[PDB]
Amino acid sequence: AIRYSIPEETESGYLVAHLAKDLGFRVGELATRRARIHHRGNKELLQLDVETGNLLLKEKPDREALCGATEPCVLHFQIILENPVQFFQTELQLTDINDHSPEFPDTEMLLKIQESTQPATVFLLKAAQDSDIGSNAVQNYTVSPNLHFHVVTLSRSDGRKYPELVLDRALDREEQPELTLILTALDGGAPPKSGTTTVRIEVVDINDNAPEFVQSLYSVEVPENSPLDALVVTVSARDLDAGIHGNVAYSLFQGGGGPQPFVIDEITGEIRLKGALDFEATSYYTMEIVATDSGGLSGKCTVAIQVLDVNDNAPKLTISSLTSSIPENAPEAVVAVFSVSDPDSGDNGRMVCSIQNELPFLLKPTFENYYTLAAEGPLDREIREEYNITIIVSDLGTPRLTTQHTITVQV
Amino acid sequence: IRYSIPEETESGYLVAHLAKDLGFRVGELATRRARIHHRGNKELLQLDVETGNLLLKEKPDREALCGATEPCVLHFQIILENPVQFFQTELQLTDINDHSPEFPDTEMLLKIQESTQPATVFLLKAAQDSDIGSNAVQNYTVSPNLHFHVVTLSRSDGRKYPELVLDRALDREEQPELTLILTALDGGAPPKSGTTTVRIEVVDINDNAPEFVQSLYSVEVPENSPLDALVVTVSARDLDAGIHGNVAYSLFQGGGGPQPFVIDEITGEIRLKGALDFEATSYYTMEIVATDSGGLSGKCTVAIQVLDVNDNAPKLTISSLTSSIPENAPEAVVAVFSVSDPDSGDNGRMVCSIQNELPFLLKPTFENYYTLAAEGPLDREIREEYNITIIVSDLGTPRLTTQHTITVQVVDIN
Ligand SMILES: *[C@@H]1O[C@H](CO[C@@H]2O[C@@H](C)[C@@H](O)[C@@H](O)[C@@H]2O)[C@@H](O[C@@H]2O[C@H](CO)[C@@H](O[C@@H]3O[C@H](CO[C@H]4O[C@H](CO)[C@@H](O)[C@H](O)[C@@H]4O)[C@@H](O)[C@H](O)[C@@H]3O)[C@H](O)[C@H]2NC(C)=O)[C@H](O)[C@H]1NC(C)=O
Ligand SMILES: *[C@@H]1O[C@H](CO[C@@H]2O[C@@H](C)[C@@H](O)[C@@H](O)[C@@H]2O)[C@@H](O[C@@H]2O[C@H](CO)[C@@H](O[C@@H]3O[C@H](CO[C@H]4O[C@H](CO)[C@@H](O)[C@H](O)[C@@H]4O)[C@@H](O)[C@H](O)[C@@H]3O)[C@H](O)[C@H]2NC(C)=O)[C@H](O)[C@H]1NC(C)=O
Ligand SMILES: *[C@@H]1O[C@H](CO)[C@@H](O[C@@H]2O[C@H](CO)[C@@H](O)[C@H](O)[C@H]2NC(C)=O)[C@H](O)[C@H]1NC(C)=O
Ligand SMILES: *[C@H]1O[C@H](CO)[C@@H](O)[C@H](O)[C@@H]1O
Ligand SMILES: *[C@H]1O[C@H](CO)[C@@H](O)[C@H](O)[C@@H]1O
Ligand SMILES: *[C@H]1O[C@H](CO)[C@@H](O)[C@H](O)[C@@H]1O
Ligand SMILES: [Ca+2]
Ligand SMILES: [Ca+2]
Ligand SMILES: [Ca+2]
Ligand SMILES: [Ca+2]
Ligand SMILES: [Ca+2]
Ligand SMILES: [Ca+2]
Ligand SMILES: [Ca+2]
Ligand SMILES: [Ca+2]
Ligand SMILES: [Ca+2]
Ligand SMILES: [Ca+2]
Ligand SMILES: [Ca+2]
Ligand SMILES: [Ca+2]
Ligand SMILES: [Ca+2]
Ligand SMILES: [Ca+2]
Ligand SMILES: [Ca+2]
Ligand SMILES: [Ca+2]
Ligand SMILES: [Ca+2]
Ligand SMILES: [Ca+2]
């Protein structure tokens, strides 16, 4: 019927309006009829000065405590006249004034966002509480300047607006494990009121980096007489990831052809012998060590073992042709034809054989490791009844191995 | 002079005719006491000088006399005594397929994550074969499957190894693990087989966001519920397992106004954090979010409607009052009063009563505004005074009452 508007939190005793003038009767009538104003329920904000016919405040009106969310804030008062009994209805509209700053319930919010999160994905954040409404309510959301994210204020929901976080640039834990941002709520009033809170984003480690080997190739040499438990070479790999995505499993791939006496440890990556070696049998070993991640990522390296020849085999002497007894007057007579063989390699397999120089016999080097023992020129029967001959062959290895065979020739 | 014979040929078999090839008669060989000599190890060959023939003495094993090195050639020197003469002859052993492809491990374990991209290659152990060339491993086949296929790489100095290739993406949610049969095919005729079991274990990754059982929750709670009261329990399920399957629950209240609601991360139980009041807040709307330990999230809406309990009794206020009433006054007004009830529904609807026998009656002027008045002129002599008691009561359950007593003295003008 009759509505007057006044701002919120107006000081007590302030004049609201002229009731007598607007309603259409003299002050004398109000004084005579003992006019009194009554709010129907709670405490009365208004007083009616009947001496002047004016309507003024008694108490400071708080919008957020008398209306709250409901808008517009209108209070209903009934002014009464005694004789005759008469009622007039008057309404008081409280204008909202920005007397509350946006504030966040929690000082800091923790977020866990996995490394493998795709861009344009949206996250929901807690909102700043504001008692005020309309233009005096929360109107904007701004985040501290950063490369990865940006903040968008969504005006959804029945009332007010909430903050949403949007990702534009893909995340990587290897560069930044965690990020820290400053979230600020800006009021719509003039001047705006601030409200800050800390946003803590924790990047979750995922398996996106394959284990890589420190060294691409390993070349190590091992003697053929090494014990069964001997450390050949230890290979290692590093993973950029952490946790179960950072643990590395080592397994070996031997060559397609021929079994190998090598075994590797899953954890340490130590390559040890699983059997005995032999340079004469296998001169070289080539294999590939693979490091598989606990997720599935793998990195491969090549390992080449060159065995070292040890002079473990002594010269072998074999008799091809021999003459049990020798003539007396035979010139350039051939006693025996023998050969030497050495399975070892290098100068360990090169042989030299010797005989007593005092003896009339001499061996002539015929072919490759092929010699013939013979007597040069005629011999005497009376002078020598018999000959015990022992030829001793030795290699040029380290150490030197010797072999001797005894033969007795009767002239 | 080189002669060729297959590996593992039975002892005593004739290798070749030396006399013919070298170019002299058998008699010369017999006369000179011709003897054949292997330079080093045991001798496979024997030279029968009675026929001038060359024959085996022992069964030749390629893999034990040559091994990897090819061609397998043995060097012999044949000797003639008088005069002393040397002729060099060589024996080439042809490899025969007498070894079946075999795998070192009976079964191989692979771990391939669910998020594995197609065309990615994995390395598998190779089947060991003693033979070489065409008699070695020549082909690799895998048991027919939807996801993978096998490719044989001819890398390494010798022979070829098996590689596994992925063509169709993997999902742990459909199939947790796969089992395949790897077979190594020899090149010889007929080919020899060699099988092994391949077990692929798919590793769980975070690719499924937690989803809520019900999109919306409607629950009602009285305004006088204790601080520790179970309002509603919300739950969500995650397809993933392990840490990718664990769910964290947190609530989002409205932008405006604080709420007395608190949520548990684990149980998803929404409980009161304070007291309620229907007169203050009639409705609550919030959003429950389920965040994964990886970062994936699922959202639902929860709306709680509080129920008004008739906890407030009617309030009676006197606006205007007259202590005493004239004698011959017609329709005289004793008082003007009002009633107020903060409750809602029939809990806030009020009815007020007075003794009907009394001449006075209350007239309903406005909404919960009444005026007490006397019906007709009154007489002084009959009644010196009146005890009046107005009783106002709401229509709620239970009914709350409030009463005010006023005593009016009817006085004549004189
Ligand atoms: C290694 O072995 C695999 C499979 O081995 C087979 O299975 C084992 C158990 C043995 O039985 C082997 O004998 C088998 O070969 C080979 O891969 C595939 O082999 C299959 C054989 O069935 C091929 O499928 C066939 O494709 C035919 C179509 O061929 C058309 O094109 C050719 C081109 O030359 C032409 O000649 C022909 O006339 C057709 O026009 C089809 O008709 C037939 O029914 C059958 O389905 C398949 O194509 C082979 N795939 C590949 C990728 O090779 C490998 O070839 C083998 N590798 C070697 C020997 O090196
Ligand atoms: C003015 O009149 C009122 C109303 O009394 C009625 O009207 C008068 C004209 C007569 O006709 C009375 O007979 C009528 O009852 C008087 O109020 C009454 O007071 C008496 C004395 O205390 C009450 O009687 C007692 O009440 C005790 C308490 O009752 C309470 O509980 C009931 C519900 O169970 C509740 O309604 C009431 O308001 C009390 O809260 C009780 O323990 C005791 O046994 C006895 O019954 C009588 O109940 C009152 N009336 C009513 C309607 O309750 C005023 O006293 C009187 N004025 C003066 C100055 O005396
Ligand atoms: C929130 O406040 C900012 C002021 O910091 C408004 O300005 C935006 O950002 C910069 C200011 O540094 C301007 O250069 C841009 O042009 C503004 N962006 C847009 C989209 O206009 C920003 O507009 C405010 N947000 C809202 C929703 O009003
Ligand atoms: C709110 O207040 C802060 C200071 O507390 C300002 O930095 C901001 O711009 C806004 O005015
Ligand atoms: C918001 O940010 C300010 C600094 O800009 C702090 O002082 C305040 O406590 C809140 O964290
Ligand atoms: C060896 O033998 C298997 C059966 O045992 C065959 O499937 C294979 O193709 C090869 O002939
Ligand atoms: Ca205020
Ligand atoms: Ca305000
Ligand atoms: Ca504000
Ligand atoms: Ca990365
Ligand atoms: Ca990794
Ligand atoms: Ca990572
Ligand atoms: Ca050796
Ligand atoms: Ca050696
Ligand atoms: Ca030697
Ligand atoms: Ca063999
Ligand atoms: Ca063979
Ligand atoms: Ca074979
Ligand atoms: Ca999946
Ligand atoms: Ca999940
Ligand atoms: Ca999964
Ligand atoms: Ca209440
Ligand atoms: Ca209530
Ligand atoms: Ca009530």
Q: Chains A and B: how many Cβ contacts under 8 Å?
A: 184
Residues of A with CB below 8 A from B37's CB? 318, 320, 339
Q: Which numbered ligand comes closest to the C-alpha of A182?
A: 5
B190: cis peptide before it, omega within 30°? yes
Compute, in angstroms, the gap from residue A399 CA to the centroid of ligand 15.
Answer: 9
Q: Tell which residue, A34, A44, A134, has the closest CA to residue A90.
A: A44
CA distance A306 to B212: 63
Report the 10 Å Cβ neighbour count for B261. 20
C-alpha angle B21-B25-B26 in degrees, rounded to nearest 5: 100
Are the CB atoms for B374 and B335 separated by under 8 Å? Answer: no
CA distance A141 to A164: 9
Greatest Cα-to-Cα distance within chain B, rounded to the nearest angstrom: 188
The torsion of the CA quartet B54, B58, B60, B66, rounded to 10 degrees, works out to: -100
Q: Tell which residue, A129, A69, A127, has the closest CA to residue A96.
A: A69
From the centroid of its chain, how far is CA B237?
A: 10
Task: Report residue A378 as tokens.
Answer: 């005629």
Region of residue B331 (left: phi > 0; alpha: psi -120 to 50; beta: else): left
| A160/B254 touch (CB, cutoff 8 Å), yes or no | yes
Which residues line ligand 6 at a C-beta cut-off of 6 Å?
B 191, 193
Residues of B with CB below 8 A from A30's CB? none
Hunting for tokens 């005629």 — which residue is that?
A378
Are the CB atoms for A352 and A375 separated by under 8 Å? Answer: no
Structural domains counted in chain A: 4
Whether A335 and A322 map to the same domain: the answer is: yes
Task: Report residue A39 as tokens.
Answer: 């709010």
Whether A292 and A328 map to the same domain: the answer is: no
Q: Which of residues 287-316 of A touch B (CB under 8 A)?
A: 288, 290, 292, 294-298, 300, 316
How buried is residue B189: exposed, middle or buried, by Cβ count under 10 Å (0-12/13-18/19+)? exposed
How buried is residue B154: exposed, middle or buried, by Cβ count under 10 Å (0-12/13-18/19+)? exposed
Among B51, B80, B98, identify where a domain stops. Answer: B98
Whether B284 and B363 map to the same domain: the answer is: no
- Our CA-based measurement puts residue B203 at a distance from the nearest CA of chain A, in whole angstroms, of 6
- Our CA-based measurement puts residue B215 at a distance from the nearest CA of chain A, in whole angstroms, of 16
Q: Tell which residue, B350, B251, B345, has the closest CA to residue B306.
A: B345
Whether B370 and B392 map to the same domain: the answer is: yes
CATH at B194 = 2.60.40.60
A84: cis peptide before it, omega within 30°? yes
Residues of B with CB below 8 A from A105's CB? 258
Whether A340 and A363 map to the same domain: the answer is: yes
Task: Report residue A312 as tokens.
Answer: 């473990």
Q: Which numbered ligand comes closest to the C-alpha of B6?
A: 17
Compute, in angstroms, the gap from residue A257 CA to the centroid of ligand 8.
Answer: 86
Among A99, A117, A134, identify where a domain stops. Answer: A99
Task: Report residue B233 as tokens.
Answer: 């329990």
How buried is residue A68: exposed, middle or buried, by Cβ count under 10 Å (0-12/13-18/19+)? middle
Q: Which of residues 150-209 of B touch A (CB under 8 A)?
A: 156-161, 203, 205-206
The torsion of the CA quartet B361, B364, B369, B375, rounded to 10 degrees, works out to: -20
Q: Which of residues 38-77 of A touch B (CB under 8 A)?
A: 38, 40-42, 68-69
DSSP state string for A35-90: -EEEESSS---EEEETTTTEEEESS---HHHHTTT-SSEEEEEEEEETTTTEEEEE
From the centroid of its chain, how far is CA A389?
A: 78
Task: Report residue A305 as tokens.
Answer: 């073992």
Whether B103 and B51 map to the same domain: the answer is: no
CA distance B6 to A398: 39
**In the beta sheet, which residues pair with residue A199?**
A109, A181
Task: Report residue A324 as tokens.
Answer: 């049990």
Q: Which numbered ligand comes closest to the C-alpha of A187?
A: 9
Report the 10 Å Cβ neighbour count for A158. 10
Q: Residue A345 half-sphere exposure, CB side, CA atoms within 13 Å?
A: 11
From the centroid of its chain, how far is CA A391?
A: 72
Hey, of B203, B286, B316, B344, which one would you mutate to test binding to chain A, going by the most A CBs within 10 A of its CB? B203
Residue nearest to atom 12 of ligand 3 (CA): A142
Region of residue A209 (left: phi > 0; alpha: psi -120 to 50; beta: else): beta
Among B184, B205, B226, identify where a domain stops. Answer: B205
Cα–Cα distance list, B202 to B25, B294, B383 (Å):
76, 18, 101
Please give the number of the atom of ligand 5 that sits closest to the Cα of A182.
2
Q: Residue B145 half-sphere exposure, CB side, CA atoms within 13 Å?
A: 23
Interface check A253 vs B, CB under 8 A:
yes
Q: Tell which residue, B218, B285, B304, has the closest CA to residue A157.
A: B285
- Solving technique for this entry? X-ray
Hunting for tokens 């002539």 — which residue is that?
A364
Run of H or E residues at A141: strand A138-143
Task: Report residue A399 as tokens.
Answer: 């150490």
Residue nearest to atom 10 of ligand 5 (CA): A196
| A259/B104 touch (CB, cutoff 8 Å), yes or no | yes
Hunting for tokens 């001169």 — which residue is that?
A283
The shortest CB-CB distance from A69 to any of B33, B67, B257 is to B257
The set of residues, in sequence order, having a beta carbon less than 8 Å from that of B190 and lying 6+ positions away, is none
Cα–Cα distance list, A172 to A113, A168, A203, B116 (Å):
11, 13, 8, 19
Q: Tell which residue, B181, B111, B204, B161, has the closest CA to residue A266.
A: B111
The one-letter amino acid code at B405 reads T
Compute, in angstroms, the gap from residue B96 CA to the centroid of ligand 16.
Answer: 8
Residues of A with CB below 8 A from B257's CB? 68-69, 129, 131
Q: Tell which residue, B130, B135, B143, B151, has the closest CA to residue B186.
A: B135
The one-letter amino acid code at B332 reads A
Are the CB atoms for B326 and B332 separated by under 8 Å? Answer: yes
Whether B135 and B83 map to the same domain: the answer is: no
Are the CB atoms for B400 and B312 separated by under 8 Å? Answer: yes
Hunting for tokens 């290692």 — which residue is that?
A236
Whether B374 and B405 map to the same domain: the answer is: yes
Q: Which numbered ligand comes closest to the C-alpha of A7?
A: 8
From the centroid of its chain, how far is CA A328?
A: 92
From the centroid of its chain, how far is CA A266?
A: 20
Q: Tell which residue, B62, B67, B106, B97, has the closest CA to residue B194.
A: B106
Whether B67 and B25 map to the same domain: the answer is: yes
**In the beta sheet, which residues pair with residue A388?**
A408
CA distance A91 to A79: 11
Query: Which residue from B minimizes the CA distance to A83?
Result: B333
Q: Which DSSP symbol is given to A402?
A: E
From the centroid of its chain, how far is CA B346?
A: 53
Task: Report residue A20 as tokens.
Answer: 């007598």
Q: Which DSSP symbol is given to A407?
A: E
CA distance B97 to B288: 71
**In the beta sheet, which residues pair with residue A87?**
A80
CA distance B292 to B248: 6
Q: Which of residues 87-116 of A touch B (CB under 8 A)?
A: 87, 105, 111-114, 116
| B40/A370 touch (CB, cutoff 8 Å), yes or no | no
DSSP state string for A227-276: -SS-EEEE--EE-SS-GGGT-EEEEEE--SSS--SEEE-TTT-EEEESS-
* HEC-encoded secondary structure of chain B: CEEEEECCCCCCCEEEEHHHHHCCCHHHHHHCCCEEEECCCCCCEEEECCCCEEEECCCCCHHHHCCCCCCEEEEEEEEECCCCEEEEEEEEEECCCCCCCECCCCEEEEEEECCCCCCCEEECCCCECCCCHHHCEEEEEECCCCCEEEEEECCCCCCCEEEEEECCCCCCCCCCEEEEEEEEEECCCCCCCCEEEEEEEEECCCCCCCEECCCEEEEEEECCCCCCCEEEECCEECCCCHHHCCEEEEEEECCCCCCCEEECCCCCEEEECCCCCCCCCCEEEEEEEEEECCCCEEEEEEEEEEECCCCCCCEEEEEEECCEEECCCCCCEEEEEEEECCCCHHHCCEEEECCCCCCEEEEEEECCEEEEEECCCCCCCCCCCEEEEEEEEECCCCCCEEEEEEEEEEECCC
Residue range of the domain that includes B277: 206-310
Compute, in angstroms, the gap from residue A6 CA to the centroid of ligand 4.
Answer: 29
CA distance B315 to B352: 11
The shortest CB-CB distance from B128 to any of A161, A258, A337 is to A258
Phi, psi of B288 (to 5 degrees): -90, 125
Are the CB atoms for B94 and B6 separated by under 8 Å? Answer: yes
Task: Report residue B263 as tokens.
Answer: 């949520």
Phi, psi of B187 (to 5 degrees): -90, -15
Cα–Cα distance list, B277 to A386, B225, B229, B299, B305 (Å):
135, 10, 15, 28, 11
Interface check B216 vs A, CB under 8 A:
no
CA distance A159 to A155: 8
Query: Which residue from B minimizes the CA distance to A122?
Result: B297
Are the CB atoms for A401 and A360 separated by under 8 Å? Answer: no
Run of H or E residues at A21: helix A19-23
